[PDB]
Design a protein around this ligand. Structure first.
Ligand SMILES: C[N+](C)(C)CCO
Ligand SMILES: C[N+](C)(C)CCO
Ligand SMILES: C[N+](C)(C)CCO
Lengths: 502, 502, 502
């Protein structure tokens, strides 16, 4: 009949989050020690497992699209797409990228130059290796799991007339038991990872936004200021989701996506243009040359440390935690397309903007720390990673206008990403109605207030190292579910191949 | 009618072996000098040729299986396989691996660390490079020639109704002349290589077995002890081949293959587990990253030496010499399968166990020579490579029980490999009867006593450097025959492509 | 009706060349400074663009031949080839290779050893890196653009019944407007690049030929001697083109192509044969291992210099400038073949001879500068690159006969390449008649005298650095036309794919 709540999933997913969020708020000092102890345990005990499973998804989705299965339509064999490609291409940006592109664009390459994982720092191979780790952390591996989840969700819904849910890919394995205890756990385990990923993103955004106001006006860094920042950021995203406007939203996304390109072009043409163009091509070459061996590097013959638990394993856990939300969002606007076209669009359209942004913005700061002798900019990336971007931007013409534009652009990016997150969260916990509409409207408020509570709890207990620990701990049970879904999809493809010739 | 002897092949193959084996036994001092002189000549004169031809086989078999020819059945287009995959897979282990997996697992990586082919020894890149040479010597190159010979033998026998012989792949080139002087030389040249490969394997096994008894009881290393060891090892394998039991044999193989995994798991869980898991993933990454360039490395710009004639060219000659026996064994249990399924089973099922064994066992010893300061273990790999495994195993709990189990497991491995070798040897020199049965039973005894004689002659004249020289010298005329067979197979595939469209 | 002149193309292409050629002859001192200033500007401003576009052509032609489009015939689906493969294979040599193979074979690897682009010179990694740059500069990248132009020209002429011209590949974009102002500029811009490439080749040939006569007889290096050398070289190639003989020409080509192999075998067997064979395999391995990363190397993190504008960007501009002449020559003898067969013949038949020549001749000189202490041979590659080959050849048996043979072979190579250039140049500026015949005979004389004038002007103003600058400056507007042609070909392939299933 009508849409409603799926109680076995809601209660399971909501009793974990609300119990975790109170222990961290009532005991901030005991929680920051245990989360710091678990982060060093994970890097040494389950570090190889993440590196092993992140490559399987990419190899699977590439081999599938290059083979003869890339001819299968994502609907019936005679229906057509519903969007202009232009409107398809632009809807991937709004959901994929967020405010954390401003937090890591300058301070992360300056950290790998002064403290490399192997070698001696401050030289010319440290820079070449740091701009390569930066391409690895934002490249094909991350966009390859989004495409996997999206393809698996669209295939079982538009060809087999099954619900749009994570458990439908287990149908070739257990049949009608996707409506029992086994299928409800798969759906409850996929909400916890999403909540923790969104919380980490929102916490990094609060930290980035608190420094711009300090630079411009003089607002202090206080615990009661961050509460108001969280309130503003989340109340501006709940009221856009419960208001039922999509024209103004998708029209405002595109405006922000043009201002982003204007800012990128200003930064490119107001600096060393030829140096930046040369380093762009150099970085592309280095990444493609070292890809097949950097996928398994764990620095096993060096002296033991905990570098891996804060940089690469964190990134693999973070992309896995964001996969359920972006996959179900891209599956809804891809009916009528073939597998090859879908995969090669998702892998290459949002990646070219991200890698260009990262290259230009990181090389602009490396060039000024190495060649112009600006050491207070590189020392800031270690003690205060939230102020490095403004220290770089204050060396440009009309510096107090570019910063005021950057603050606004960054706020709008976060709003247009959180607004789409709450809708998908309310859909993953509903049941019934038409298989093209979203869940009830009282669940968006609930799943927004829950994320606000989690973020508030995790920042006031350990800052940046607590978010990275919670994500790595909570993304573990969903990787095995992804492997099971891969098995089910492979088992469906063989019945496809037999049925086309028999 | 009935099976019988193929006299033109038997006399040609038996007059070379019996004449070679008496000269070495009657003149042990003059034979050890000439075999040592030939080993340094070969490494410099025909070293590039082996590296050039070993890559052709692998590229051929991979491109064939990835193309549209991978759809062709290895029988008629409507018959089905005869085995359970489980029993097909387990039968590849029994024939492929032997007792020499215990002789090289610990002492070879410890040799590449203290005496690298390029660089300075005892450091942390010497270990990373040695564990990469070890993966190259036991990886895809060796299992890629087995698959080539097996596919070529099954194709011409189950689709064109030709004999199961090495000369049938020359039919598209010379027609009915495979039953004349040209086809008999091709079959006689393939028995000599097999005999010398088996002799080298048996000699390394005698050396490995003589040290365990010294460690346990106190048996000396004497020339009259090795004669009794050879007698026991070969008399235990002739009586299993002339007795006509396959249930008890294939059932005892599987028992030994479970004890091997139990021993591997004990060694993994009784040591530094996390270090070993990390180094496993690191080794996989390093091998896959350096594969396309290490295929042609001959160290040509360095100072001249003879490193290549004892390590890499020896391994290429040894795999080529073992190809005729394993190919005809795997061709008999693969009727009804497609080319792609056969190739991707043979390349990946027996390789994962071998590479895991090598990685775990080599890293366990590198970790204890570098980090725990055990120099008498690394000095033993240079002066006495037969005692290094026991020196490593004596640092574990209950050390005198694990060694007594290892000795037994190693003896059973050799027996289940030699038993299958003699049957195929008696088949390669027979003619007539049904094309699913084996040759007469008086030829198994003959080809076993011949191998015993060759091994006895080669050990008492130069020990380990004489076996490596004889193999490299006697595997030269069979590589050209393999190239001719590749030409014939390519010429048959084009007549396949037309007939499917005309 | 009959063939005639295409005046809008002729006047456009002939007013640029004749105006450029007089300014350089009337002002030799002011022209050598501006051409030297432009060479350093280009290396820094448009260096990344050439590296970016040269890889697109290769990736396009490889992916096209490996896909299902490699089955399309280059004519009608039922006609057969017209040549014997033997006469097809041999006609690619005569047009592809020229006299500049003798100018760079010895002096270029000796320059990269003593002045590497990165590192320290005179050691054993400088040699390994120089023999790798030499393989990059004469390998797959250059032969991959020839195949692209040839395939694009044959496809639109033998399947769609369009003229054999460069503008026919713009038909899917603008239709009947290929016979107006847009199509005439595309054809006029393709003659200027060809003229400048031919001029550079002829200038290097004059320099190489002037030193052999100095060595043999004692002819000085004078400005009035080079005028006579140019007169002889070009008058011997106009009289072969206006005489109408192809049997004697294609028959004399094959004779020269046998003398070349005889000379290569003499040089291989009169020196260190085993060292040379080992280094050949080593070079193949190094090139294939470093190919996917050396395609984007611009040395961006090193100290700024102008190395790129004289070595790699010059080579990319030179191959692009030679593409229009060789593409239209190979398109005329390839009717009836499939795309895959054409591409894999062009990529692999002329490349194996070139890479073997380069390897043997460069390693013969590296081995004698490093190991035998011959420093006057390596100092000559810096101050006088035209005399290095004779200094190397004078250390062989019967040295005054090999040099007299080399001079003749080099002269005949240039003649058989220029003779075919003038015919294609007269065809690119004609219109009418049968689409299998060549243009009028008064245009061959014109386009030969024009090249002579350009060469005379560019050598008397800056020698070797002026040719390299003119080529890099004049090959810029044709790369964009090549991109447009790629777009048109892709747009035609999709109408192929739809029409085979509908
Ligand atoms: C926030 N992540 C980096 C995980 C994904 C961005 O789209
Ligand atoms: C003994 N070889 C290494 C040659 C083959 C093992 O299957
Ligand atoms: C002269 N180039 C090197 C440009 C081409 C030779 O065929």
């Amino acid at each position: 009949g009508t849409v409603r709540m799926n109680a076995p999933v809601f209660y399971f997913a909501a009793s974990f989050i609300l119990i975790f969020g109170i222990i961290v708020i009532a005991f901030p000092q005991a929680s920051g020690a245990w989360l710091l102890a678990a982060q060093n345990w994970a890097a040494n005990t389950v570090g190889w497992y993440y590196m092993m499973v992140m490559t399987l998804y990419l190899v699977f989705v590439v081999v599938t699209a290059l083979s003869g299965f890339g001819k299968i339509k994502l609907g019936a064999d005679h229906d057509e797409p519903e969007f202009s490609y232009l409107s398809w291409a632009g809807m991937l940006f709004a959901a994929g990228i967020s405010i954390t592109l401003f937090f890591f664009c300058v301070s992360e390459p300056l950290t790998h130059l002064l403290q490399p994982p192997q070698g001696e720092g401050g030289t010319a191979e440290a820079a070449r290796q740091g701009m390569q780790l930066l391409f690895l952390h934002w490249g094909l591996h991350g966009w390859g799991v989004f495409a996997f989840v999206g393809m698996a969700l669209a295939y079982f819904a538009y060809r087999h007339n099954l619900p749009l849910a994570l458990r439908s890919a287990l149908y070739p394995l257990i049949g009608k038991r996707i409506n029992g205890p086994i299928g409800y756990a798969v759906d409850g385990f996929g909400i916890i990872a999403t909540i923790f990923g969104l919380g980490a993103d929102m916490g990094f955004g609060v930290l980035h936004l608190n420094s711009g106001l300090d630079y411009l006006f003089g607002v202090p860094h206080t615990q009661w200021i961050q509460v108001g920042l969280i309130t503003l950021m989340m109340g501006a995203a709940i009221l856009v989701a419960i208001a039922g406007v999509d024209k103004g939203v998708r029209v405002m996304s595109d405006i922000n996506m043009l201002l982003a390109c204007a800012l990128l072009l200003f930064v490119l043409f107001a600096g060393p243009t030829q140096h930046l163009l040369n380093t762009l091509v150099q970085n592309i070459g280095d990444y493609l040359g070292a890809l097949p061996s950097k996928s398994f590097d764990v620095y096993a013959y060096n002296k033991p440390s905990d570098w891996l638990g804060g940089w690469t394993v964190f990134y693999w856990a973070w992309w896995i935690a964001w996969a359920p939300f972006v996959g179900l969002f891209i599956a809804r606007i891809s009916r009528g397309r073939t597998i090859r076209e879908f995969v090669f669009g998702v892998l290459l359209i949002p990646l070219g903007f991200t890698l260009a942004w990262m290259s230009i913005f990181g090389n602009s700061a490396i060039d000024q720390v190495l060649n112009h002798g600006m050491a207070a900019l590189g020392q800031s990336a270690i003690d205060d990673p939230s102020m490095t971007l403004y220290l770089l931007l204050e060396t440009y013409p009309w510096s107090k206008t570019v910063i005021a534009v950057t603050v606004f652009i960054s706020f709008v990016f976060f709003v247009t990403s959180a607004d789409s997150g709450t809708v998908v969260l309310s859909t993953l916990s509903a049941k019934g109605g038409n298989p093209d509409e979203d869940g009830p409207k009282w669940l968006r408020v609930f799943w927004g207030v829950a994320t606000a509570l989690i973020t508030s709890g995790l920042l006031f207990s350990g800052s940046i190292d607590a978010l990275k620990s919670a994500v790595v701990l909570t993304s573990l049970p969903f990787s095995l579910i992804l492997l099971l879904m891969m098995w089910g999809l492979h088992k469906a493809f063989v019945m496809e191949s037999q049925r086309q010739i028999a």
